[PDB]
Amino acid sequence: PWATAEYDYDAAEDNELTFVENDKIINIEFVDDDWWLGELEKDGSKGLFPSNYVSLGN
């Protein structure tokens, strides 16, 4: 599925995404309970992000 960011998230590590509220994260992979892997719609970057920063769908 894809999701919409509810809050800005700033990466703190090289393997993380950085995004702002309302950005879409696509091709989500549920690799962990608290951290998911995804791809930004806006630029194709991929990485980990804390799951509570997004909400699936629109």
Swiss-Prot record:
The superkingdom of the source organism is Eukaryota
* Modified how: The actin depolymerizing factor homology (ADF) domain mediates actin filament binding.
Its subcellular locations are: Cytoplasm, Cytoskeleton, Actin patch
Q: Where is the SH3 domain?
A: 1-58
sequence repeat locations:
32-41
**Subunit text:** Binds F-actin, but not G-actin. Interacts with the ARP2/3 complex. Interacts with APP1, ARK1, PRK1, SCP1, SRV2 and YIR003W via its SH3 domain. Interacts with the SH3 domain of RVS167 and with SLA1.
* Summary of the function given for this chain in its UniProt record: Regulates ARP2/3 complex-mediated actin assembly. Recruits ARP2/3 complex to sides of preexisting actin filaments, which may promote nucleation or stabilization of filament branches. Binds to actin filaments, but not actin monomers. Actin binding is required for ARP2/3 complex activation. May also have a role in linking the actin cytoskeleton to endocytosis. recruits components of the endocytotic machinery to cortical actin patches, known sites of endocytosis.
What family, per the record? Belongs to the ABP1 family.
Leftover remarks: Present with 606 molecules/cell in log phase SD medium.
Name by which UniProt lists this protein: Actin-binding protein
Q: Which organism is it from?
A: Saccharomyces cerevisiae (strain ATCC 204508 / S288c)
Upper classification of the source organism reads: Eukaryota, Fungi, Dikarya, Ascomycota, Saccharomycotina
- Tell me the gene name: ABP1
Please tell me where this chain falls within the complete protein, as first and last residue plus total length: 535 to 592 of 592
